[PDB]
Design a protein around this ligand. Structure first.
Ligand SMILES: *[C@@H]1O[C@H](CO)[C@@H](O[C@@H]2O[C@H](CO)[C@@H](O)[C@H](O)[C@H]2NC(C)=O)[C@H](O)[C@H]1NC(C)=O
Ligand SMILES: *[C@@H]1O[C@H](CO)[C@@H](O[C@@H]2O[C@H](CO)[C@@H](O)[C@H](O)[C@H]2NC(C)=O)[C@H](O)[C@H]1NC(C)=O
Ligand SMILES: *[C@@H]1O[C@H](CO)[C@@H](O[C@@H]2O[C@H](CO)[C@@H](O)[C@H](O)[C@H]2NC(C)=O)[C@H](O)[C@H]1NC(C)=O
Ligand SMILES: *[C@@H]1O[C@H](CO)[C@@H](O[C@@H]2O[C@H](CO)[C@@H](O)[C@H](O)[C@H]2NC(C)=O)[C@H](O)[C@H]1NC(C)=O
Ligand SMILES: *[C@@H]1O[C@H](CO)[C@@H](O[C@H]2O[C@H](CO)[C@@H](O)[C@H](O)[C@H]2NC(C)=O)[C@H](O)[C@H]1NC(C)=O
Ligand SMILES: *[C@@H]1O[C@H](CO)[C@@H](O[C@H]2O[C@H](CO)[C@@H](O)[C@H](O)[C@H]2NC(C)=O)[C@H](O)[C@H]1NC(C)=O
Ligand SMILES: *[C@@H]1O[C@H](CO)[C@@H](O[C@H]2O[C@H](CO)[C@@H](O)[C@H](O)[C@H]2NC(C)=O)[C@H](O)[C@H]1NC(C)=O
Ligand code: NAG
Ligand code: NAG
Ligand code: NAG
Ligand code: NAG
Ligand code: MN
Ligand code: MN
Ligand code: MN
Ligand code: MN
Ligand code: MN
Ligand code: MN
Lengths: 539, 927
């Protein structure tokens, strides 16, 4: 023999809900480093633990649309920052704040061309003078004084552009790839608040303006804090934005106005980890929006893999709620800050290649902390073995991200993702990148559809009968929280008026008639107003 | 599939002139020779005070590689007043767009600014320049009296241009109106015979143009790209333009009438911000004379193996049906970040086989983003989705990416030879390259050995040295080749023969040639004609019995062959290439006589057989089918034995059968060579006598709907012996069957309504639902999950309308989803009730008097359902809370169905029927 090892080399342990970390270098992912040694076609099971460390130093940057329309949004925001701190203080012992604004490429088509030279300075059409175009300017890096934010945001004046869509994508980029200037710090939760009230220019739009050099993804601001290639370089692509976002562990939040919300929402669906929020007309709302998205960012542990030799493949099994396990998955959602989750990873090479360090990564998205895996290999007519479709030879051994005898099966769960996120709507299981419904009379690509399924009044009861009654199941499986979330409230005497929700009624264990209601508006609300004072038998 | 990459034509331009940003071919009618047209959008000029007005250069193919500009215009900026210019030519990107015909060449400046004559402005309206030898006229369809952004002030017309065969220009101005865009077709000569140097407007008579659309369509970019072809009916070229920002950054491609300018067709993108429309191109890629649409969205993010989104690009290939519909497929890029449908450039017919080609481009591919170009060939079926060749840039970045393939052009046969050509343009290095298509030869080889069945004890020839007679056998090998182009006369070849190929490095070479005792003989013949197959011959002997042991491992003779240079055309030896799908190897088999007792002939007795196991397959899903064959030899030797299973259009061979200790693992392989699909299996070369085999061939039958009732297979073994070579063709059919698991689920919205009834007033006559009661809602769903689909069925719902003259669950109305029409025997909602405006237990039918809804269904496929949504109203007289047991009632509702008909009549279809119920219990709760 010549066994395959998996030796943990560095075992820093989770810092149990301690975010300030007194020179304890704060850990968030337990097994910091391991070193397996595989042999021909052999595998090795291991695992990784990662927790949403309480009191994690936040970082918040304010990218805002400085188009003439966001003039009133500069009023009820000059006071902000100071107003933000009292909210984020309840969430962090340390918090950095920042600002920076965009408009559009200061060139011909977008910018006010050059009719009277009396325009290179303002917006002479009304009589009021504003500012010339600028594209992207960095004012006030990331600092402590939540007052300094107020000092700069007072000094900020709006501008004016010709074109409908702004060029804020250039900003989202510079404000991600320019670490030192902005002041993004290592062990700290990152947040990029992108506020806008109008459309945007995508990549290739710059051909008109005469720009054929594509975005490089590098930092281009100078000592003057203005994006230099704004005029020499075309807009960044959804892919390259998406690339540099994950590498710098930034979280893109889209604080956008109603008219353009559905838009930045599908733009959100192509840049996973993007959070969209309905900004207000006078943008006063920007806070109970920010301090919200934070909750969303810290309620999921997605596992990303940087590098990795093509020769070997990983298999994941995520266990999150009360050690019940979820096979084939490297992501857990519905989490509360402080909790810890474990994934049991596996690895196997299809016939060992040639020696080299070959060290890759496995880490949660947005987290600085990662598990470094150094892999080494202990090595030193036709062929009916087929059936084709990824199937190799000797006797048939599928590739990475493929399974099954013939090799039809997949490892992908994205084809089983749903509207809400839960795999196969919660009514079924993903089988070879394709749901197979545990049919309560349901069907659909992800089992979304179920006409003959019981009304919500029945699904939600499960919640109220616990989150307010300490009984029933959920109490029994300890899942009446992460599973049955929402937000309950003991509505005073009678219930709500807004007829945009269902009113439910039911008899509980104690022979009393409980009365509730399932609402859902604003930003995906979901209150369950419970009429306190159940009708019970008198005596 | 092949064009020269050894020696292509390299062309250059000034550093930063963007030379090679717009490429085209120049074929004058007035000359025997042809040229290159390369745009230099950023090149400086000798026009007074004009910085980078850009230009266009006519390059020489006459192996001089010298390109001197083309005098379109050399004047500076025209005036409107004293020190008040009328237009501004500097940085106009003239050359950014270039097209031509015969002597006629159109070149535009989409960054041409024009100060309107009303106010002091600098609007990028853009102009073109149509030259024709001496006569040069400015063409600016967008320089009208109607100005500013709201009009055509920012039109930048000339962004994309193109001619129709009837000599008419199509133009694209993206910024017209509110950046929605615009198309403008004007016939030349109307452009030529209308130019007046004293008017900056000029109305053209038969001009065609798209109009201002609603505000919602703003910023779509129509005119970003343009291609032209005949789609609508017959006649001329119709207009095709890519609107990369249409929809919600989704993209859209518009097709317009070549004369009305009315919208014919439309195409929409699947993933937004992918720039679906950056490039368009129409070509008949499958010789049925129908322009096919190709569309590029270079920023499309496909799902990579691991499931992650990756920007790699995609090309939408819409094939045009005869009905005007499309059979649109898809084609993704290969590397990430290298753009792909960035430039689709249809070539003529590179290989020249009666099918057009096309070259898609990834400008930023290869190593160090030097970009590559992929050439995809056509076929009767559509486009062969697999690259037939890849052209790689060879230039390093100067200050930005070389951008090789950003702009390419190929379709004209610039050189002598009978095949097209291609021009590619790397402007990040300022270059254009000529890839000359090379001659394609199709060759036919032949190999046949005289005595086929070698006899050891045969006395025929004599060894070279010793005159000892030895067992002879001759071997000849014909070779015929002829190509379609400029190449013939000397197709010389290097042939290589091989005796006993099956014999590895072990060295038991059972056979050798004559005069040169060795199994390897070398030769080099020649030919040229398409039917003059020159044939060479040889003599080979066999070693004596006392030199080797064989056991009959056929002496296979092998044949190889190849081309040579100095068969090419003068102008830089343009070497040809053998057809892509033609093997250079041909090999036959010999067989030492053994066991073929006395007649010397090995005449066998072959027989197949299949047990008919599992007599049925259903219509709808994939039916797994295994065949148990019993092939055997009851005669003598069976040289090169093989099973021949014939299969239909929906059979599809899986594999043999290993998962069985009783079955054999034959060397079976799938094949279609002719208008026939079939499985073959080695039954052992010399399938010895009495040799019995019994294996399993599994398939997976797809349905094909009605299409008769059974499916035949045709079994038979066939060999190489001159006598009794085949077995009786045994045919085997399995019967189709009908299966359709249909079911009926039902449910109640408020399944439980508590009677203490919060807030309710007994009205004299109800007018609203609130005056009546709660909304109890029943829902029944008829669903077919079975394999086979049905064509019609019946649905019957019974409603608990009332009990003893007194109502309970007054239906307001009902809704249907799917294939079904209904009818209630009683009028639903008699009391005209509207929306808001501001015994002991069980009930239902049988006890209460029904109101029935009968519904006619028809058309539920393998995974389709029909739903009936009944919307009631608990009529609150379920009260009577005074005397007895008004305490609890259960309102029962029950629907049933009967599948009466199916699409197959051939198969024995039986009726499917079942029922279900739905309760709404109204109890007293508190009491
Ligand atoms: C064309 O000539 C101009 C000037 O001779 C070159 O650039 C201009 O002049 C200097 C030279 O770099 C620059 O500092 C200016 O900014 C340029 N003017 C403008 C309006 O941009 C230019 O490089 C030459 N172009 C080519 C392709 O040779
Ligand atoms: C293709 O898309 C265009 C634009 O979406 C459609 O044209 C619109 O048609 C409506 C119909 O009344 C007009 O009111 C609009 O003015 C049109 N807008 C534009 C920009 O043309 C068109 O109908 C679609 N499909 C086809 C076949 O034409
Ligand atoms: C002669 O033998 C075959 C040609 O039939 C060549 O070997 C491979 O044959 C398969 C046939 O399925 C082709 O798909 C491969 O492309 C061939 N391999 C290569 C490297 O070309 C073999 O190369 C031929 N040898 C000569 C000298 O012509
Ligand atoms: C309505 O009540 C009926 C009975 O009154 C329920 O149907 C069955 O009732 C009997 C009575 O004891 C039970 O034994 C059965 O188990 C019940 N069947 C089922 C499937 O539970 C009926 O379920 C009730 N329906 C609603 C919507 O509340
Ligand atoms: C690839 O996966 C399929 C998916 O099941 C497997 O084949 C099945 O096909 C039918 C469903 O499509 C089942 O009803 C059959 O039981 C099963 N058929 C076979 C031959 O296994 C199988 O693993 C692969 N399919 C093929 C044709 O190889
Ligand atoms: C249950 O349905 C709606 C809740 O969506 C309640 O209707 C509300 O709105 C009506 C019109 O504005 C008001 O007239 C109702 O008073 C108001 N509901 C309340 C509790 O104030 C409806 O009333 C609810 N049912 C009951 C019995 O209250
Ligand atoms: C109606 O429903 C299915 C057929 O699609 C069958 O259901 C019966 O079989 C099972 C009994 O253990 C369960 O599925 C059902 O509870 C049961 N229903 C009844 C009424 O017995 C049933 O065979 C079908 N009925 C007919 C006539 O085909
Ligand atoms: C975003 O989402 C909608 C559905 O909400 C979908 O039609 C499309 O992807 C986008 N719609 C709009 C209006 O942007
Ligand atoms: C995933 O499935 C379970 C989860 O622990 C376990 O078998 C293992 O970790 C993974 N599968 C395999 C085959 O190892
Ligand atoms: C062109 O004429 C009108 C639109 O201008 C339309 O009715 C007709 O169908 C179009 N096509 C033809 C062939 O006339
Ligand atoms: C002698 O040589 C062969 C041996 O292969 C023998 O079968 C036959 O009788 C003779 N040859 C011919 C051509 O008849
Ligand atoms: Mn505003
Ligand atoms: Mn036509
Ligand atoms: Mn066609
Ligand atoms: Mn072809
Ligand atoms: Mn040629
Ligand atoms: Mn015989």
């Amino acid at each position: 023999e010549f066994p395959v090892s998996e030796a943990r080399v560095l075992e820093d342990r989770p810092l149990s809900d301690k975010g300030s970390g007194d020179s304890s270098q704060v850990t968030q992912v337990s097994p910091q480093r391991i070193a397996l040694r595989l042999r021909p076609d052999d595998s090795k099971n291991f695992s990784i633990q990662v927790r949403q460390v309480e009191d994690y130093p936040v970082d918040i940057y304010y990218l805002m649309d400085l188009s003439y329309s966001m003039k009133d949004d500069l009023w009820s925001i000059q006071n902000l920052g100071t107003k933000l701190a009292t909210q984020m203080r309840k969430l962090t012992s340390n918090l950095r704040i920042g600002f920076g604004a965009f408009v559009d490429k200061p060139v011909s088509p977008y910018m006010y061309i050059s009719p009277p030279e009396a325009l290179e300075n303002p917006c002479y059409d009304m009589k009021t003078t504003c500012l010339p175009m600028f594209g992207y300017k960095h004012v006030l890096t990331l600092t402590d004084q939540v007052t300094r934010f107020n000092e700069e945001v007072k000094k900020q004046s709006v501008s004016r552009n010709r074109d409908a869509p702004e060029g804020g994508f250039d900003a989202i980029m510079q404000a991600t790839v320019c670490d030192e200037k902005i002041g993004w710090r290592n062990d700290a939760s990152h947040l990029l608040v992108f506020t806008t009230d109008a459309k945007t220019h995508i990549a290739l739009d710059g051909r008109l303006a005469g720009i054929v050099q594509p975005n490089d993804g590098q930092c281009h601001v100078g000592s003057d804090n203005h994006y230099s290639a704004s005029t020499t370089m075309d807009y960044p692509s959804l892919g390259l934005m998406t690339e540099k976002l994950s590498q710098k562990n930034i979280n893109l939040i889209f604080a956008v106005t109603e008219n353009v919300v559905n838009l930045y929402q599908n733009y959100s669906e192509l840049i996973p980890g993007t959070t969209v929020g309905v900004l207000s007309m006078d943008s006063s709302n920007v806070l109970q929006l920010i301090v919200d998205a934070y909750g969303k960012i810290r309620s999921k542990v997605e596992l990303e893999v940087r590098d990795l030799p093509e020769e070997l493949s990983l298999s994941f099994n995520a266990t999150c709620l009360n050690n019940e396990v979820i096979p084939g998955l490297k992501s857990c959602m519905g989490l509360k800050i402080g909790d810890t989750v474990s994934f049991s990873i596996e690895a196997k090479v299809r016939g060992c290649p040639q020696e080299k360090e070959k060290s890759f990564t496995i880490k949660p998205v947005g987290f600085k902390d990662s598990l470094i895996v150094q892999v080494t290999f202990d090595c030193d007519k036709g062929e009916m073995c087929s059936g084709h479709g990824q199937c190799s030879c000797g006797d048939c051994l599928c590739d990475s991200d493929w399974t099954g005898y013939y090799c039809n099966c997949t490892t992908r769960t994205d084809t089983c993702m749903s509207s809400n996120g839960l795999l196969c709507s919660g009514r079924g299981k993903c089988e070879c990148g394709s749901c197979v419904c545990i049919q309560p009379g349901s069907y659909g690509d992800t089992c979304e559809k179920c006409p003959t399924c019981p009304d919500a009044c029945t699904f939600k009861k499960e919640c109220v009968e616990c989150k307010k009654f300490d009984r029933e199941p959920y109490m029994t499986e300890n899942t009446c929280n992460r599973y049955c979330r929402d937000e309950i409230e003991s509505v005073k005497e009678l219930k709500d008026t807004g007829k945009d929700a269902v009113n439910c009624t039911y008899k509980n264990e104690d022979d009393c008639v409980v009365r509730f209601q399932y609402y859902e508006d604003s930003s995906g609300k979901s209150i369950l107003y419970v009429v306190e004072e159940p009708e019970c038998p008198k005596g | 599939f092949n064009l020269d990459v050894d020696s292509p034509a390299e062309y250059s331009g000034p550093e930063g002139s963007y030379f090679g940003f717009a490429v085209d071919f120049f074929v004058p009618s007035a000359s025997s020779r042809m040229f290159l047209l390369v745009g230099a959008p950023k090149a400086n000029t000798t026009q007074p005070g004009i910085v980078e007005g850009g230009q266009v250069l006519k390059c020489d193919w006459s192996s001089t590689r010298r390109c001197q500009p083309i005098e379109f215009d050399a004047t500076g900026n025209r005036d409107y007043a004293k020190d008040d210019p009328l237009e501004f030519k500097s940085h106009q990107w003239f050359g950014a767009s270039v097209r031509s015909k015969q002597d006629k060449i159109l070149a535009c400046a989409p960054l041409y600014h024009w100060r309107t004559e009303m106010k002091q402005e600098r609007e990028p309206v853009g102009t073109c320049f149509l030259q024709d030898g001496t006569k040069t006229v400015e063409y600016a369809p967008c320089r009208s009296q109607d100005i500013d952004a709201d009009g055509q002030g920012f039109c930048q017309g000339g962004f994309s241009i193109d001619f129709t065969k009837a000599d008419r220009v199509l133009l694209g101005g993206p910024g017209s109106f509110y950046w929605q865009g615009q198309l403008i077709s004007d016939q030349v000569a109307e452009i030529v015979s209308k130019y007046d140097p004293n008017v900056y407007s000029i109305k053209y008579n038969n001009q065609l143009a798209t109009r201002t659309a609603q505000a919602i369509f703003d910023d779509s970019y129509l005119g970003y790209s343009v291609a032209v072809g005949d789609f609508n009916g017959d006649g001329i070229d119709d207009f095709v333009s890519g609107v990369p920002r249409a929809a919600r950054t989704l993209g859209m491609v518009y097709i317009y009438d070549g004369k009305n300018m009315s919208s014919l067709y439309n195409f929409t993108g699947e993933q937004m911000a992918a720039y679906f429309g950056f490039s368009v191109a129409a070509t008949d890629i499958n010789g049925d004379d129908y322009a096919d649409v190709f569309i590029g969205a270079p920023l499309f993010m496909d799902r990579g193996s691991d499931g992650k989104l990756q920007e790699v690009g995609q090309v939408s290939v819409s094939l045009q049906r005869a009905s005007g519909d499309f059979q649109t497929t898809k084609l993704n890029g290969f590397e990430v970040f290298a753009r792909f449908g960035s430039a689709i450039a249809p070539l003529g017919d590179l290989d020249q086989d009666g099918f057009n080609d096309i070259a898609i481009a990834a400008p930023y591919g290869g190593e160090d983003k030097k970009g590559i170009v992929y050439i995809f060939n056509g076929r009767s079926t559509g486009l062969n989705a697999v690259p037939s060749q890849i052209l790689e840039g060879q230039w390093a970045a100067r200050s930005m990416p070389p951008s090789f393939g950003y702009s390419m052009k190929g379709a004209t046969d610039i050189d002598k030879n009978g095949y097209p050509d291609l021009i590619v343009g790397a402007f990040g290095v300022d270059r254009a390259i000529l890839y000359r298509a090379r001659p394609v030869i199709t060759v036919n080889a032949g190999l046949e050995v005289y005595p086929s069945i070698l006899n050891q004890d045969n006395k025929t020839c004599s060894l070279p040295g010793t005159a000892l007679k030895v067992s002879c056998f001759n071997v000849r090998f014909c070779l015929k080749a002829d190509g379609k182009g400029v190449l013939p006369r000397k197709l010389n070849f290097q042939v290589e023969l091989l005796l006993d190929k099956l014999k590895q490095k072990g060295a038991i070479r059972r056979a050798l040639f004559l005069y040169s005792r060795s199994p390897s003989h070398s030769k080099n013949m020649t030919i040229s004609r398409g039917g003059l197959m020159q044939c060479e011959e040889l003599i080979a002997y066999l070693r004596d019995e006392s030199e080797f042991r064989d056991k009959l491992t056929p002496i296979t003779i092998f044949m190889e062959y190849r081309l040579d240079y100095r068969t090419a055309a003068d102008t830089t030896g343009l070497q040809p290439i053998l057809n892509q799908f033609t093997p250079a190897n041909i090999s036959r088999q010999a067989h030492i006589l053994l066991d073929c007792g006395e007649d010397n002939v090995c005449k066998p007795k072959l027989e197949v057989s299949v047990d008919s196991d599992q007599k049925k397959i259903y219509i709808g899903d994939d039916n797994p089918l295994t065949l148990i064959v019993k092939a055997q030899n009851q005669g003598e030797g069976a040289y090169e034995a093989e099973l021949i299973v014939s299969i239909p259009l929906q059979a599809d061979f899986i594999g043999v059968v290993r998962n069985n200790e009783a079955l054999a693992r034959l060397s079976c392989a799938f094949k279609t060579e002719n208008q026939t699909r079939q499985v073959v299996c080695d039954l052992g070369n010399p399938m010895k006598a009495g040799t019995q085999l019994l294996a399993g061939l599994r398939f997976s039958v797809h349905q094909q709907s009605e299409m008769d009732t059974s499916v035949k297979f045709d079994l038979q073994i066939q060999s190489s012996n001159l006598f009794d070579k085949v077995s009786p063709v045994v045919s085997h059919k399995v019967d189709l069957a009908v299966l359709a698991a249909v079911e009926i689920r039902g449910v109640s919205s408020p399944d439980h309504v508590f009677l203490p009834i919060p807030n309710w007033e007994h009205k004299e006559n109800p007018e609203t639902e609130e005056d009546v009661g709660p909304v109890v809602q029943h829902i029944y769903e008829l669903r077919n999950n079975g394999p086979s689909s049905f064509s019609k069925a019946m649905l019957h719902l019974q409603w608990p309308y009332k009990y003893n003259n007194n109502t309970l669950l007054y239906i307001l109305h009902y809704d249907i989803d799917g294939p079904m029409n209904c009818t209630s025997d009683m009028e639903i909602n008699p009391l005209r009730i509207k929306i808001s405006s501001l015994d002991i237990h069980t009930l239902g039918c049988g006890v209460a008097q029904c109101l029935k809804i009968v519904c006619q269904v028809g058309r539920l496929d393998r995974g389709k359902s029909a739903i009936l949504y009944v919307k009631s109203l608990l009529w609150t007289e379920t009260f009577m809370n005074k005397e007895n047991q008004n305490h609890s009632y259960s309102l029962k509702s029950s629907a049933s169905f009967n599948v009466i008909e199916f699409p197959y009549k051939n198969l024995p279809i039986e009726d499917i029927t079942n029922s279900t119920l739905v309760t709404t219990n109204v109890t007293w709760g508190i009491q």
